[PDB]
Ligand binder design. Sequence first.
Ligand SMILES: [Mg+2]
Ligand SMILES: [Mg+2]
Lengths: 290, 290
Amino acid sequence: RCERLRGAALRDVLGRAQGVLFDCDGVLWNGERAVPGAPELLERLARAGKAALFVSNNSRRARPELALRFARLGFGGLRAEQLFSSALCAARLLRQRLPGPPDAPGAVFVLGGEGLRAELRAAGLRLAGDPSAAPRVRAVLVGYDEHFSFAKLREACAHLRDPECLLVATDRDPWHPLSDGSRTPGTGSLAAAVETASGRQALVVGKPSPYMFECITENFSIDPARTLMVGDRLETDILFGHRCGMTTVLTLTGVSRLEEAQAYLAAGQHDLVPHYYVESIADLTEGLED
Amino acid sequence: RCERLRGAALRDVLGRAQGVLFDCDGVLWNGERAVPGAPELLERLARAGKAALFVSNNSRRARPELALRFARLGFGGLRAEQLFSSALCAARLLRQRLPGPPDAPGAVFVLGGEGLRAELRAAGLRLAGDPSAAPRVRAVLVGYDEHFSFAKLREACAHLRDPECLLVATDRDPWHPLSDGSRTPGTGSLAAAVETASGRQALVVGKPSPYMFECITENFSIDPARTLMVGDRLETDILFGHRCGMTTVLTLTGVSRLEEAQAYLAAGQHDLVPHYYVESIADLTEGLED
Ligand SMILES: [Mg+2]
Ligand SMILES: [Mg+2]
């Protein structure tokens, strides 16, 4: 129904909620700059005894470095266990799913940087291109790869020739905004290249995939009916929220515009329609008030 | 109806035809090896006074080097004017369509090698990355780019931010077979990456695009109702043949299997169903016989 969230309703929605899931970029901050009032919403949520957790499709950085951004931008006492990234969760799914014999479960061919590789190793996954004592490659992982090349695409497809080799994508985010006003290509753009050349569909880890929620709920009980999902991207965070059965809030500090959300409601595409919208998440603090 | 082409029917089909359009790879040859009897079909067609022309989605080589392959593999007196490649035709469409003011029609940002660039220049197109006297980039061309990188993908999308900048793809061939038994990623795989990151649909030049036929018929009159289209790929050559209104022949020396064609006929997908099939194009010579 895309309701602007204020007043009596806002107080009710937040009061009933046991917890809040926050996308990060476009939500808490944009580039170098925190959304004013965002850290203090988080303080007021802790103080109201409502759980905050964070869901990021970022596969560029391992958790401990991704956590750094919080403090850097004025988000104080957040513990790394509150942060879930597609990198963390890709590492976890591969451990859960690697198809090979117990004695040698398989190597993962990874398209991604050093942060992503760390997470994978941190989960006990063997990587192709790590020094040998070559091991059979049993999954291809496509992450945000700034050094993506045709040669890598060619290698990924050679591995995927074996149909028992998994294809995994961290996310399908097509592109990402930068401070200046330019976009960077996303993982979804690289996944599309790998899918097309190999003739395969990827297993997607990050939002809007329901697996990202399975990853959050390994370490925490979350009743999605009592949880809010807050994000800036309709096709990522809002869609995620719907598939998980959460009340969705669109914040207008990021990628999607209100026009796009109103378009989808008129088209009846209810999965990409937010329950609520705030101009920025500093607008939710008012509904917690002492 | 997917009829195996022989006997009385074969003699009739070839007798009525004024001309034949041949895909090259998987049709005339595979890798280093000519299909036996293929050069002599071509001799017998000339001798029957039936026109042969050649249609290739190849954007790797400029015409004069692409022509070399013919003689190299025992295809004698073929003149370069009989050969149409997506590279040649991409060069032509860009000249026809570049959106800029008469005094400076615009530079083309190209994802492709030295062969492709030559064709583009040979048509009088200005290239980004050629030395300056930067010129405004008014088209992005995605060809077969063996040196494709994330950095190039990022640059192509920056150009495409301007919506008056054209997106052009030479072809959408996802992958290509090699002698050994491995595939190389196709242009379609790189086009999918560029499309996804930029949020745009490419203008496609090569088969199955109807534009490839417009490109052939600039230099030649072809009555498609009296022309045969022969290829190995259902989704490329057969589909092309259908959209152009030609009688389509599948040859079994290349990518598509007869099973795949029979599947599509049962699914009623008539555009990807060949009129006829031969095991190899050496089987058509018999229907010309003196
Ligand atoms: Mg976001
Ligand atoms: Mg072919």
